[PDB]
Amino acid sequence: MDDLLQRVRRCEALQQPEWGDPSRLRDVQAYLRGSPALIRAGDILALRATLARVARGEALVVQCGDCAEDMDDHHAENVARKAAVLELLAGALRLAGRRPVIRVGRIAGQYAKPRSKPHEQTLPVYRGDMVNGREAHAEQRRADPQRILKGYAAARNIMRHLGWDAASASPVWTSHEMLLLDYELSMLREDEQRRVYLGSTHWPWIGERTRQVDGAHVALLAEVLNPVACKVGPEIGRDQLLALCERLDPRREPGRLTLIARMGAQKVGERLPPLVEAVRAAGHPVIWLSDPMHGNTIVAPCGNKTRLVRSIAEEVAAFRLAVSGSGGVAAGLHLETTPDDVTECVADSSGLHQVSRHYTSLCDPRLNPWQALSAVMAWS
Amino acid sequence: MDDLLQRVRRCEALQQPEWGDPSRLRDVQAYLRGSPALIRAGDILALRATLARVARGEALVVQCGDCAEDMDDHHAENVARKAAVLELLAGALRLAGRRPVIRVGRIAGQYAKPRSKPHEQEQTLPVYRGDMVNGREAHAEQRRADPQRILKGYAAARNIMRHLGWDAASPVWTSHEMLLLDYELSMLREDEQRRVYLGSTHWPWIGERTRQVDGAHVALLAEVLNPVACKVGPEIGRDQLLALCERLDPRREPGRLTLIARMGAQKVGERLPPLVEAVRAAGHPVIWLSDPMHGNTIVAPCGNKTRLVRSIAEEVAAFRLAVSGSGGVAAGLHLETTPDDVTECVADSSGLHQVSRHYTSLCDPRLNPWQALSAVMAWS
Ligand SMILES: [Cl-]
Ligand SMILES: [Co+2]
Ligand SMILES: [Co+2]
């Protein structure tokens, strides 16, 4: 509505950029507010019903794409390649998990990243293509809200290429981290019954560092038609998580809430099961996906951070044991990947030396399709 | 039409079963003649145009399924798993080949197999020739040829077509070896312009041992709307192949003819290129697929004949070099596969006694999905 904006704008907002010109933002937000939504409420409903099936344990989920999307990579060929990666993993998971697989993308809006510390020589950290320039500088890192406008345009293109231009396939659903508010608040819409929905993406999640119960991001998604998701990390409280679930799934609707566990290969086995049982006890028909990526980030001797593939697979296996054991629906995988033949991730600790070459990520290390294949295989 | 039947029944017919009861056949053929076709002529035309694209080099093909389809495997779950295998390989090929991939199945009619030796090794029962002809069992009664089986095959095929989505996308096209004339002749149909088509399958091929130019099977497919294909083996003559092409692609239509090279890992490199160049010279816009299975069959001390995965991959690589070198369109792969986690094929010579466990194939050894994955990878 506009009610919702008011409510959300009177909460605390984390990881929000300092936009240079207040006027330009007002202009941008106006333009976005008066533009077509990227997705449709009927499709949202469609997906929502599918995720109800996933909560009943009769279907599985593969979510995959870049850490930080490149918004010159909005062209037919390259999105085709990303969709092919999804084909590959979907088929693999179907065979490993013996259930139907829903394809979901980290695409058409992954243009913002949250930062642990805001601040080379004490410069401002890179925030994504929707916020600031890639190269480390003074002026480039200056936040430019026109980038949001460019991001919208690229996202529209990607949606067209994906097949959400007209009504018809076996669809590729769209998801990205709903961290930003100026963009996202401008993308709110109402349906035929005045029920509000987020119009930027089918299936948004909230990042680990913006999931405060009394916070803005939760408030937004709390009152939104879209199926919602939330990242969950090792050092979250039982009581915390319960409150979070009450706000995002008050009616205990199966398919509504999705919790993506990212707590690392070692910690997951000890941390996850108490959380899962409490949510089961609370009566939330939640669906758990594993995020074995962000739990297991590791610094290589040369090159950036990487992740050992063995570690990722370990976590996937442990995740399923934990969730299934404690009585929850273990429903699939959340991975960051790429079609490009990169070496950003390596099989194991021995391989650490060859990280450097073929490393193209704007942010976190991604899995090459075949590495991701290994990760999905662990599911059994 | 019916004149076609006359013509085709005039020619020489190989690998045709000795049906026990003649009258029952007449009844069966009548019933089939008066039953709905499994596929439709508009879909055929759809596919035909797609294969024109494949002949221009703007798309690729994955054909895969069982050597000998099991008739009681006609249920939603199991065909879902087969389609998932196709998802997996299609995605893989798309990534390796950097072009759009067409999914085609060895399904809904692969119920007959051609045999070199009518009998086998106490008894000496006649060899089992597919679930549409003979019992799997090793006695004398089951091996008795029963034409009711054709009727059962039709029924199972109808079910599979429904589950595949042709009852009313990212379509799974259907193919099988056009072999049982009694069945197949009964499945001939006419469209709105009285153009005849084979109504059992979208995309039929003829096996290497029934591809005689002046033979029955060629004659049938010669005058049929469906896109047609033909297996091509090591010892085929230049002149032979040319004549074959003239009969199956008289008007030089791109997308019409498909030649599936199955020659073996060693022989393919030397034998294929002269054939490919001659057809190029003849001006036939043909599309070549590799069949690295049938060229490379090997006996196992422990079990029934297997295939080394390394050999299969070798042939795939060699196939592409040969075809691309000599100026023809190398357009994809033809593989006998299964979703089941079997050991019917082994990586290489090292796996001596592993073939013991998990060997369920009615006929020739199949690839497990992951082994097939390796085979598709060789395309690179
Ligand atoms: Cl059924
Ligand atoms: Co990331
Ligand atoms: Co075979």
Side-chain angles (χ1 to χ4, degrees), chain A residues 1-5 8 11-17 19-20 22-23 25 27-32 34-122 124-134 136-141 143-191 193-276 278-279 281-304 306-309 311-313 315-320 322-328 330-352 355-370 372-380, chain B residues 1-5 7-17 19-25 27-32 34-77 79-116 118-120 122-124 126-136 138 140 143-166 168-237 239-246 248-266 268-279 281-303 306-307 309 311-352 355-356 359-370 372-380:
Chain A
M1 305 192 241
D2 295 60
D3 182 27
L4 189 71
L5 291 107
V8 172
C11 314
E12 197 184 337
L14 299 200
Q15 297 288 314
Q16 291 305 310
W19 301 105
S23 53
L25 211 66
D27 279 8
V28 161
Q29 290 191 308
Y31 181 90
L32 291 183
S35 290
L38 287 60
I39 61 109
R40 301 188 287 262
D43 294 348
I44 276 164
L45 306 179
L47 171 51
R48 173 67 93 83
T50 299
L51 302 189
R53 291 171 45 215
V54 171
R56 304 209 281 280
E58 28 181 317
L60 302 173
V61 182
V62 176
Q63 218 173 356
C64 87
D66 307 311
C67 202
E69 216 182 348
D70 179 295
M71 75 161 116
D72 302 315
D73 191 4
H74 59 287
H75 288 279
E77 173 62 24
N78 280 100
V79 40
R81 306 217 301 129
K82 290 176 188 183
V85 167
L86 269 160
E87 289 179 47
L88 191 162
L89 303 180
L93 185 57
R94 162 88 227 212
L95 294 167
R98 302 152 297 178
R99 315 210 98 72
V101 183
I102 294 305
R103 291 161 205 77
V104 183
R106 270 166 144 259
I107 334 172
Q110 264 304 349
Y111 295 138
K113 299 297 258 150
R115 291 301 193 181
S116 42
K117 293 88 179 186
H119 293 272
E120 82 99 314
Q121 286 238 274
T122 65
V125 62
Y126 173 64
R127 288 266 175 165
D129 286 33
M130 257 203 312
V131 179
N132 50 7
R134 275 117 91 152
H137 268 343
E139 191 73 70
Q140 304 310 267
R141 300 297 222 235
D144 179 11
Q146 273 272 303
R147 295 183 176 282
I148 295 165
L149 229 69
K150 275 289 124 201
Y152 169 84
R156 181 177 181 170
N157 273 321
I158 282 154
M159 289 283 181
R160 171 163 52 92
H161 297 316
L162 276 187
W164 307 96
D165 208 29
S168 198
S170 178
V172 161
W173 294 102
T174 70
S175 61
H176 67 257
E177 176 196 3
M178 196 256 149
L179 177 131
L180 277 201
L181 302 179
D182 296 305
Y183 168 66
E184 298 278 5
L185 280 179
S186 291
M187 294 300 293
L188 299 170
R189 300 287 186 262
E190 297 166 0
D191 69 332
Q193 328 192 6
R194 294 206 89 163
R195 301 180 295 177
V196 323
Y197 64 99
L198 191 60
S200 46
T201 189
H202 293 114
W203 196 6
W205 76 87
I206 327 197
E208 172 80 48
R209 26 171 89 77
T210 49
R211 60 162 168 75
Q212 303 85 232
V213 166
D214 304 303
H217 303 85
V218 166
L220 201 155
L221 300 197
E223 291 177 39
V224 156
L225 240 190
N226 307 62
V228 295
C230 194
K231 300 283 209 101
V232 170
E235 275 86 67
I236 190 177
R238 202 233 282 265
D239 275 45
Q240 300 191 325
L241 182 50
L242 268 281
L244 194 51
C245 280
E246 273 289 337
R247 210 93 147 64
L248 293 184
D249 186 12
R251 278 87 119 93
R252 267 77 178 187
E253 304 163 79
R256 166 69 169 158
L257 190 40
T258 296
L259 301 175
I260 308 167
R262 18 88 84 247
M263 24 191 71
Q266 196 74 22
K267 294 197 145 190
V268 61
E270 189 249 31
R271 294 298 229 286
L272 188 42
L275 301 173
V276 181
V279 184
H284 294 284
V286 176
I287 80 195
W288 300 84
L289 315 179
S290 188
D291 180 357
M293 309 295 304
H294 292 85
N296 295 307
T297 308
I298 303 301
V299 184
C302 166
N304 249 318
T306 59
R307 293 148 179 161
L308 311 194
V309 169
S311 54
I312 302 184
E315 179 153 357
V316 170
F319 164 75
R320 202 188 172 179
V323 171
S324 183
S326 314
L333 302 174
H334 184 121
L335 321 174
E336 288 184 317
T337 64
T338 189
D340 300 323
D341 184 1
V342 299
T343 74
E344 289 162 4
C345 290
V346 205
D348 60 18
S349 190
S350 67
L352 274 181
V355 162
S356 58
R357 185 61 171 89
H358 277 80
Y359 195 113
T360 299
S361 307
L362 274 308
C363 188
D364 287 342
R366 297 157 309 169
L367 308 190
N368 62 79
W370 327 113
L373 211 157
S374 317
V376 310
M377 294 300 293
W379 188 259
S380 87
Chain B
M1 305 195 249
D2 298 60
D3 57 347
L4 182 51
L5 216 167
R7 304 164 202 262
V8 171
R9 273 305 188 191
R10 279 155 151 202
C11 312
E12 197 165 329
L14 260 64
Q15 297 288 316
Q16 291 304 312
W19 302 111
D21 316 82
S23 195
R24 290 313 311 260
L25 205 139
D27 279 9
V28 161
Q29 290 191 308
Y31 181 44
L32 291 183
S35 289
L38 278 43
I39 61 171
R40 51 184 77 91
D43 291 343
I44 294 169
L45 298 160
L47 171 51
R48 179 130 167 184
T50 279
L51 302 189
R53 289 206 316 141
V54 171
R56 295 197 265 282
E58 335 171 337
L60 301 174
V61 182
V62 177
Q63 265 196 293
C64 86
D66 307 310
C67 202
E69 215 180 352
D70 178 295
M71 203 156 54
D72 294 299
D73 187 13
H74 58 279
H75 288 262
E77 174 68 10
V79 63
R81 295 162 84 251
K82 291 175 190 179
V85 168
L86 270 160
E87 288 178 46
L88 188 298
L89 303 180
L93 186 57
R94 177 64 180 86
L95 293 167
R98 295 180 298 177
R99 313 208 100 77
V101 183
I102 303 301
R103 291 157 258 249
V104 183
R106 270 168 144 262
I107 209 171
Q110 203 65 300
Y111 294 138
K113 295 259 82 173
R115 278 282 178 226
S116 44
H119 304 269
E120 59 181 67
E122 160 70 4
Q123 283 148 312
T124 59
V127 67
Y128 153 96
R129 291 167 165 271
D131 274 8
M132 257 201 190
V133 178
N134 264 46
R136 304 193 305 99
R143 299 301 187 85
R144 186 162 184 165
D146 179 11
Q148 213 74 44
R149 291 201 140 208
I150 295 166
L151 230 69
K152 278 158 60 79
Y154 169 83
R158 181 177 181 170
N159 273 321
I160 282 154
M161 289 283 181
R162 171 174 89 262
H163 296 293
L164 277 187
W166 306 97
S170 184
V172 162
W173 300 96
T174 70
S175 62
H176 67 257
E177 194 214 343
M178 204 253 86
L179 189 57
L180 290 206
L181 300 158
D182 296 305
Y183 167 65
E184 297 278 8
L185 281 178
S186 292
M187 286 322 268
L188 299 170
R189 299 288 187 276
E190 296 171 19
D191 68 36
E192 316 220 348
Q193 326 197 339
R194 295 208 87 177
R195 300 179 301 176
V196 324
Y197 64 99
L198 191 60
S200 46
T201 189
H202 292 113
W203 197 8
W205 76 86
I206 51 201
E208 183 178 2
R209 26 169 83 80
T210 48
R211 60 160 168 69
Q212 302 82 30
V213 166
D214 304 303
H217 303 265
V218 167
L220 201 155
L221 300 197
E223 267 207 280
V224 175
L225 188 147
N226 307 63
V228 295
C230 194
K231 300 283 209 101
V232 170
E235 273 75 35
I236 190 179
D239 276 46
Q240 301 194 352
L241 183 50
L242 267 281
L244 196 51
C245 280
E246 275 309 311
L248 293 184
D249 181 55
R251 294 159 274 184
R252 270 76 175 231
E253 303 165 273
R256 175 83 217 288
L257 248 174
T258 290
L259 302 175
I260 302 97
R262 16 82 85 246
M263 298 203 226
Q266 225 53 17
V268 61
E270 63 185 342
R271 221 151 278 189
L272 189 42
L275 300 173
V276 181
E277 203 152 68
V279 184
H284 290 287
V286 176
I287 80 195
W288 300 84
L289 314 179
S290 188
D291 180 356
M293 309 295 305
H294 312 104
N296 295 307
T297 307
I298 320 294
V299 182
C302 274
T306 59
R307 293 147 179 161
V309 169
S311 53
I312 302 184
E314 255 184 63
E315 178 157 18
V316 171
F319 164 74
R320 203 193 179 184
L321 276 161
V323 171
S324 306
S326 314
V329 201
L333 302 174
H334 184 123
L335 313 176
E336 260 174 347
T337 65
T338 188
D340 299 323
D341 289 345
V342 299
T343 74
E344 289 162 4
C345 289
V346 198
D348 184 1
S349 188
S350 48
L352 255 299
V355 182
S356 58
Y359 195 115
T360 299
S361 202
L362 269 43
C363 190
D364 298 340
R366 297 158 309 169
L367 309 190
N368 64 83
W370 329 114
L373 201 166
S374 318
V376 168
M377 294 300 293
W379 190 259
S380 293

mmCIF file of all heavy atoms in Angstrom, chain B residues 104-120, unseen atoms left out:
data_model
loop_
_atom_site.group_PDB
_atom_site.id
_atom_site.type_symbol
_atom_site.label_atom_id
_atom_site.label_comp_id
_atom_site.label_asym_id
_atom_site.label_seq_id
_atom_site.Cartn_x
_atom_site.Cartn_y
_atom_site.Cartn_z
ATOM 1 N N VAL B 104 15.421 -35.482 -26.958
ATOM 2 C CA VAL B 104 14.721 -36.567 -27.636
ATOM 3 C C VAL B 104 14.916 -37.852 -26.849
ATOM 4 O O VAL B 104 15.982 -38.086 -26.287
ATOM 5 C CB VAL B 104 15.248 -36.771 -29.066
ATOM 6 C CG1 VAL B 104 14.457 -37.858 -29.783
ATOM 7 C CG2 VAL B 104 15.191 -35.464 -29.843
ATOM 8 N N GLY B 105 13.876 -38.677 -26.809
ATOM 9 C CA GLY B 105 13.870 -39.864 -25.965
ATOM 10 C C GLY B 105 13.885 -41.141 -26.777
ATOM 11 O O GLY B 105 13.288 -41.210 -27.848
ATOM 12 N N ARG B 106 14.607 -42.138 -26.279
ATOM 13 C CA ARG B 106 14.422 -43.516 -26.718
ATOM 14 C C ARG B 106 13.330 -44.161 -25.880
ATOM 15 O O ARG B 106 13.612 -44.881 -24.920
ATOM 16 C CB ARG B 106 15.721 -44.308 -26.552
ATOM 17 C CG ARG B 106 16.634 -44.284 -27.762
ATOM 18 C CD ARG B 106 18.009 -44.837 -27.421
ATOM 19 N NE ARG B 106 18.590 -45.600 -28.526
ATOM 20 C CZ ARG B 106 18.564 -46.929 -28.631
ATOM 21 N NH1 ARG B 106 17.872 -47.671 -27.779
ATOM 22 N NH2 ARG B 106 19.175 -47.521 -29.647
ATOM 23 N N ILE B 107 12.077 -43.874 -26.217
ATOM 24 C CA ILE B 107 10.985 -44.197 -25.316
ATOM 25 C C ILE B 107 9.664 -44.310 -26.073
ATOM 26 O O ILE B 107 9.549 -43.843 -27.210
ATOM 27 C CB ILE B 107 10.892 -43.146 -24.189
ATOM 28 C CG1 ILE B 107 10.319 -43.751 -22.909
ATOM 29 C CG2 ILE B 107 10.045 -41.960 -24.622
ATOM 30 C CD1 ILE B 107 10.416 -42.821 -21.718
ATOM 31 N N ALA B 108 8.683 -44.950 -25.445
ATOM 32 C CA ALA B 108 7.349 -45.104 -26.015
ATOM 33 C C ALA B 108 7.383 -45.862 -27.341
ATOM 34 O O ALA B 108 6.745 -45.458 -28.312
ATOM 35 C CB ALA B 108 6.686 -43.745 -26.200
ATOM 36 N N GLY B 109 8.114 -46.971 -27.375
ATOM 37 C CA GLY B 109 8.104 -47.837 -28.551
ATOM 38 C C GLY B 109 9.371 -48.634 -28.782
ATOM 39 O O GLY B 109 9.423 -49.469 -29.688
ATOM 40 N N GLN B 110 10.410 -48.365 -28.000
ATOM 41 C CA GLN B 110 11.608 -49.178 -28.093
ATOM 42 C C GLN B 110 11.337 -50.546 -27.488
ATOM 43 O O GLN B 110 11.816 -50.876 -26.406
ATOM 44 C CB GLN B 110 12.802 -48.512 -27.418
ATOM 45 C CG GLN B 110 14.130 -49.020 -27.939
ATOM 46 C CD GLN B 110 14.386 -48.681 -29.400
ATOM 47 O OE1 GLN B 110 13.642 -49.069 -30.298
ATOM 48 N NE2 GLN B 110 15.490 -48.016 -29.642
ATOM 49 N N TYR B 111 10.533 -51.331 -28.192
ATOM 50 C CA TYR B 111 10.073 -52.603 -27.670
ATOM 51 C C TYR B 111 10.460 -53.734 -28.617
ATOM 52 O O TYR B 111 9.974 -54.852 -28.488
ATOM 53 C CB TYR B 111 8.557 -52.563 -27.470
ATOM 54 C CG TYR B 111 8.077 -51.593 -26.407
ATOM 55 C CD1 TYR B 111 6.954 -50.801 -26.619
ATOM 56 C CD2 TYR B 111 8.684 -51.538 -25.157
ATOM 57 C CE1 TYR B 111 6.484 -49.940 -25.643
ATOM 58 C CE2 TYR B 111 8.215 -50.690 -24.171
ATOM 59 C CZ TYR B 111 7.118 -49.889 -24.419
ATOM 60 O OH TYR B 111 6.662 -49.029 -23.443
ATOM 61 N N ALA B 112 11.356 -53.440 -29.553
ATOM 62 C CA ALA B 112 11.858 -54.447 -30.476
ATOM 63 C C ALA B 112 13.353 -54.238 -30.694
ATOM 64 O O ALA B 112 13.829 -53.106 -30.738
ATOM 65 C CB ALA B 112 11.105 -54.374 -31.797
ATOM 66 N N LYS B 113 14.091 -55.337 -30.796
ATOM 67 C CA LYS B 113 15.518 -55.283 -31.077
ATOM 68 C C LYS B 113 15.858 -56.240 -32.219
ATOM 69 O O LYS B 113 15.257 -57.311 -32.336
ATOM 70 C CB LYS B 113 16.324 -55.638 -29.822
ATOM 71 C CG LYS B 113 16.196 -54.655 -28.663
ATOM 72 C CD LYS B 113 17.398 -53.708 -28.571
ATOM 73 C CE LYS B 113 17.305 -52.523 -29.514
ATOM 74 N NZ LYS B 113 18.420 -51.565 -29.264
ATOM 75 N N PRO B 114 16.782 -55.832 -33.100
ATOM 76 C CA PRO B 114 17.243 -56.686 -34.176
ATOM 77 C C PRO B 114 18.378 -57.584 -33.684
ATOM 78 O O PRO B 114 19.185 -57.160 -32.857
ATOM 79 C CB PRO B 114 17.762 -55.679 -35.196
ATOM 80 C CG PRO B 114 18.342 -54.594 -34.347
ATOM 81 C CD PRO B 114 17.515 -54.553 -33.084
ATOM 82 N N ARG B 115 18.422 -58.815 -34.176
ATOM 83 C CA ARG B 115 19.403 -59.792 -33.719
ATOM 84 C C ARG B 115 20.102 -60.474 -34.887
ATOM 85 O O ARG B 115 19.476 -60.822 -35.889
ATOM 86 C CB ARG B 115 18.720 -60.833 -32.835
ATOM 87 C CG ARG B 115 18.534 -60.390 -31.396
ATOM 88 C CD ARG B 115 19.822 -60.504 -30.589
ATOM 89 N NE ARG B 115 19.631 -60.033 -29.219
ATOM 90 C CZ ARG B 115 20.457 -59.214 -28.568
ATOM 91 N NH1 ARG B 115 21.580 -58.777 -29.134
ATOM 92 N NH2 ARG B 115 20.159 -58.835 -27.331
ATOM 93 N N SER B 116 21.407 -60.677 -34.730
ATOM 94 C CA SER B 116 22.241 -61.317 -35.748
ATOM 95 C C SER B 116 22.056 -62.839 -35.751
ATOM 96 O O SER B 116 22.054 -63.466 -36.811
ATOM 97 C CB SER B 116 23.713 -60.970 -35.505
ATOM 98 O OG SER B 116 24.037 -61.068 -34.129
ATOM 99 N N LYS B 117 21.905 -63.420 -34.563
ATOM 100 C CA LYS B 117 21.790 -64.875 -34.422
ATOM 101 C C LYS B 117 20.465 -65.280 -33.757
ATOM 102 O O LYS B 117 20.302 -65.109 -32.551
ATOM 103 C CB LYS B 117 22.959 -65.420 -33.598
ATOM 104 N N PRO B 118 19.540 -65.872 -34.535
ATOM 105 C CA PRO B 118 18.171 -66.169 -34.083
ATOM 106 C C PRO B 118 18.060 -66.996 -32.797
ATOM 107 O O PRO B 118 17.027 -66.940 -32.120
ATOM 108 C CB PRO B 118 17.564 -66.948 -35.252
ATOM 109 C CG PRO B 118 18.387 -66.601 -36.441
ATOM 110 C CD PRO B 118 19.746 -66.192 -35.959
ATOM 111 N N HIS B 119 19.096 -67.769 -32.481
ATOM 112 C CA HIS B 119 19.066 -68.646 -31.311
ATOM 113 C C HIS B 119 20.227 -68.319 -30.372
ATOM 114 O O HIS B 119 21.131 -67.558 -30.732
ATOM 115 C CB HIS B 119 19.145 -70.112 -31.748
ATOM 116 C CG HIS B 119 18.078 -70.509 -32.719
ATOM 117 N ND1 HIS B 119 16.861 -71.023 -32.322
ATOM 118 C CD2 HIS B 119 18.039 -70.452 -34.071
ATOM 119 C CE1 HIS B 119 16.129 -71.289 -33.390
ATOM 120 N NE2 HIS B 119 16.816 -70.938 -34.463
ATOM 121 N N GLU B 120 20.200 -68.900 -29.174
ATOM 122 C CA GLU B 120 21.269 -68.709 -28.188
ATOM 123 C C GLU B 120 21.528 -69.987 -27.384
ATOM 124 O O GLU B 120 20.779 -70.958 -27.488
ATOM 125 C CB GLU B 120 20.939 -67.539 -27.249
ATOM 126 C CG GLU B 120 19.636 -67.681 -26.469
ATOM 127 C CD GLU B 120 19.352 -66.482 -25.575
ATOM 128 O OE1 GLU B 120 19.109 -65.378 -26.110
ATOM 129 O OE2 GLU B 120 19.376 -66.638 -24.336
#
